[PDB]
């Protein structure tokens with residue numbers, strides 16, 4: 078499996094490109110949250126940005142890390158333009174509950190569930 | 192009962208003035224738009240009934256949702272719908288729009304336009320015939336004939 | 348005027364102004380990656396926060412290689 | 428036989444066999460299979476490292492113009508080492524002939540994005556990036572086309588099911604359109620239609 | 636419990652829950668957002684109306700395929716109310732016009748309407764009839780509104796005593812009334828302490844009260860944790876707005892008080908998180924011209 082690379086030869090440029098992506102997302106929040114006329118503080122949106130980076134801790138392969146950086150760069154293009162809208166950014170937020178449980182007791186009463 | 196008689200007369204007047212024209216907007220996504228264009232045919236006129244094409248949404252009386260609504264389109268559909276004169280009506284034209292139809296499954300189709308807007312007048316078909324569309328507009332006018340708006344307002 | 352003292356004091360108050368510094372706990376031998384429990388996410392937050400406040404462009408390898416307030420004070424007192 | 432059976436050609440089949448053998452000889456570097464079916468349209472089947480060389484050679488060399496492009500499709504097949512199949516389909520203007528140029532690839536290894544020799548393939552390449560995931564190196568813009576913005580998954584796969592993982596409706600609580608896990612109103616009763624008794628005996632692979 | 640009343644599957648959009656709701660009112664504000672959360676929950680809502688059908692068409696896209704259903708009644712009859720409460724698992728009572736029409740006073744709406752409907756609700760054998768009430772509805776003077784709601788509390792406690800009386804404070808939301816009157820300006824100096832409560836935490840408390848037993852008999856209260864002054868709230872609402880058929884029972888209400896009662900449990904005891912007024916006030920403080 079001597080696979081062709083994408084962007085990085087090892088994990089070093091992978092970490093460098095994803096930290097550059099996170100740099101762009103930190104400096105990308107206030108312009109969009111002031112432009113799109115949202116209802117949410119800047120710090121809460123930045124915390125969901127860092128939470129979405131925290132979701133992907135198990136990602137190992139350099140192809141996959143580079144492909145996540147490609148997806149993030151494409152979405153940052155579509156959010157530095159207004160191709161997307163308020164609906165999509167509020168769809169990144171999960172506000173309209175859906176308070177769907179995790180306890181086995183609450184998976185038992187409200188049941189037919191694992 | 193001079194007060195309620197005057198209220199009944201004036202409510203009948205304004206309801207007649209409502210049901211006269213009903214100029215729509217030319218929304219028309221897919222080939223039910225082509226059926227709308229053939230409801231703009233000489234053999235089946237709409238300007239006999241004051242149904243006149245007025246492309247700007249802020250003065251159209253009804254909205255004829257026609258063509259397959261998708262998820263990429265639906266925010267544009269409602270953000271057109273939400274800015275309009277305060278009486279507003281929806282004619283859902285075609286099996287795509289009024290319950291999904293042939294694409295009722297298959298992602299990025301809203302399962303009928305009931306999930307986005309309130310829908311008064313359904314006309315089903317693939318396509319609906321132009322004769323059926325004009326019958327739907329006539330039954331919309333009869334819904335306008337039974338408003339009793341100012342009667343409800345006065346006996347409130 | 349742009350010696351070590353004003354730079355270190357302004358780094359001091361903007362780290363105090365930083366949000367999730369837990370606790371404040373500032374040191375010139377801090378090394379908050381493996382001594383204070385602050386992740387590399389928070390590391391790059393701090394570095395381009397300094398960039399946003401008063402620093403230079405701080406390119407990505409030198410934005411990676413500070414790791415500690417001592418090298419921050421030294422580099423901004425170096426180039427400026 | 429004489430009616431009701433579509434008659435086959437002979438000399439066009441001979442010429443396409445000769446031309447496929449011609450191409451297969453004069454490019455020993457990128458050739459695995461050439462084949463002709465009964466309806467006489469040429470097929471070339473290619474390792475994915477000479478895509479721009481084969482398309483430049485099949486645009487020029489003056490005994491094969493083939494100036495018209497079609498469809499690119501990386502038609503998804505499971506079970507294989509290389510799922511995805513890039514399928515070019517070319518038509519010539521001076522010749523009246525049809526070739527299919529099928530090169531193969533897997534889920535992650537990119538190909539060289541042949542937009543620089545055929546300008547038609549730009550939106551095709553963007554579309555097949557959005558629907559499959561065959562990444563395209565040396566390409567100007569990879570945006571998303573035929574999909575929603577906030578939607579992802581490359582939904583023409585056999586992993587993504589028929590109905591989606593997303594559903595949209597409206598609420599007046601926050602006055603906007605929200606997403607939900609999907610709730611079908613009907614089962615989509617799938618029809619088992621796999622007949623017994625050897626539908627075509629001529630296509631019997633060697634049994635394991 | 637009958638078959639096909641039992642709950643099923645994941646929540647929302649054909650999740651046939653253990654409630655069959657019958658809502659009175661709901662053409663206005665709070666009942667409409669309550670039907671919004673019920674269609675989010677996915678039950679069948681029987682709602683009547685005597686109005687023009689615009690608002691009931693407006694709340695048509697809420698439920699699933701053919702779930703919600705509409706009928707008619709008036710403040711004269713008994714047959715239509717009985718027809719509404721023929722087969723109802725849960726039933727709620729929101730009612731009240733904040734000004735005097737020529738035939739419905741502030742008198743006899745809170746007297747004549749909850750009596751008949753709550754009586755035929757007990758005579759239909761329903762469980763957990765819920766009735767709203769304002770905070771500090773006292774027999775004490777200077778409040779026709781609050782004393783008529785106190786008489787309504789007395790009547791509902793008299794017939795079917797184990798009905799759930801719910802009292803929140805003033806409700807700020809998306810289509811608020813008192814905060815609209817706060818915004819409705821263009822010289823006066825007064826003070827009275829006051830704390831409001833947000834509408835979606837209120838209705839989450841409503842649905843937790845309607846599907847969580849041990850709740851009956853004892854009345855519940857729903858107040859936000861604010862506890863500050865009217866003058867600070869006027870400064871707040873005009874700093875966010877960036878500006879320099881109505882009666883004076885409105886101004887009596889907003890200069891009355893907001894006092895607490897430690898006898899009855901509230902938000903955290905019932906188990907729903909209370910949200911302050913900050914970003915929801917940023918929501919509901921629109922209409923200003925070019926500062927956004």
Ligand SMILES: NC(=O)C1=CN([C@@H]2O[C@H](COP(=O)(O)OP(=O)(O)OC[C@H]3O[C@@H](n4cnc5c(N)ncnc54)[C@H](OP(=O)(O)O)[C@@H]3O)[C@@H](O)[C@H]2O)C=CC1
Nearest residue numbers: 660661662663664665686729730731732769803804805806
């Ligand atoms: N914070 C609190 O605790 C407060 C609670 N409330 C209560 O909460 C509810 C909603 O509040 P609010 O915004 O003020 O009012 P709403 O406009 O939202 O609701 C009042 C409802 O009462 C109906 N109604 C009133 N009189 C009649 C009648 N004679 N015949 C038929 N229907 C009638 C109205 O119907 P329609 O519009 O079709 O005529 C409407 O559906 C009300 O029940 C109100 O008493 C009110 C204020 C403060």
Ligand code: SF4
Nearest residue numbers: 222223285286287317
């Ligand atoms: S209902 Fe039929 S005619 Fe109308 S848009 Fe759909 S496919 Fe076209």
